[PDB]
Scaffold this active site. Structure first.
Site, short mmCIF file in Angstrom:
data_model
loop_
_atom_site.label_atom_id
_atom_site.label_comp_id
_atom_site.label_asym_id
_atom_site.label_seq_id
_atom_site.Cartn_x
_atom_site.Cartn_y
_atom_site.Cartn_z
N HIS A 47 0.83 -1.20 0.00
CA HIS A 47 0.00 0.00 0.00
C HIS A 47 0.86 1.25 0.00
O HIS A 47 0.62 2.16 -0.79
CB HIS A 47 -0.92 -0.06 1.23
CG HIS A 47 -1.85 1.10 1.37
ND1 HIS A 47 -1.90 1.87 2.52
CD2 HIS A 47 -2.76 1.63 0.52
CE1 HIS A 47 -2.81 2.82 2.36
NE2 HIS A 47 -3.35 2.69 1.16
N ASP A 89 -5.89 2.36 -2.10
CA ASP A 89 -6.69 2.15 -0.90
C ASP A 89 -7.63 0.93 -1.04
O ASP A 89 -7.75 0.11 -0.13
CB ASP A 89 -7.50 3.41 -0.56
CG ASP A 89 -6.66 4.54 -0.03
OD1 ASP A 89 -5.48 4.33 0.36
OD2 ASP A 89 -7.13 5.68 0.07
#
Length: 121
Positions: A47, A89
């Site tokens: 991420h 996300d």
């Protein structure tokens, strides 16, 4: 922004983003770097690799548009940079959900484990 990320994490994992993932392992949370301790931690590493390459918008504060439609996440954002933020996300929320089976509360306390040098993205 963190508002969208936190909602995505609730939607996919059923968990409170701050209390469950705000400080987990070597990669989940502000200031966290290091080699991943487990699959959840690896999600957070991926991420950060994903959003840190974006130059034209801010991951923490810039809101974007998405829908939770048919029990999945759809990025519906016109700003190209914010669309990429949204995809980062979305990916971490899905990743965290797929790895709930090995989530381990021991990684929520920084003193309980060591972090090796970070790997490359």
């Amino acid at each position: 922004s963190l508002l969208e990320l936190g909602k995505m994490i609730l939607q996919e994992t059923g968990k409170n983003a701050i209390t469950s993932y705000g400080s987990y392992g070597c990669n989940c949370g502000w200031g966290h770097r290091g080699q991943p301790k487990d699959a959840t931690d690896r999600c957070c590493f991926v991420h950060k690799c994903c959003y840190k390459k974006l130059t034209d918008c801010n991951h923490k504060t810039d809101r974007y548009s998405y829908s939770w439609k048919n029990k999945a996440i759809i990025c519906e954002e016109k700003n190209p940079c914010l669309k990429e933020m949204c995809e980062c996300d979305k990916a971490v929320a899905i990743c965290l959900r797929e790895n709930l089976d090995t989530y381990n509360k021991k990684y929520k306390a920084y003193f309980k484990f060591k972090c090796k040098k970070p790997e490359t993205c």
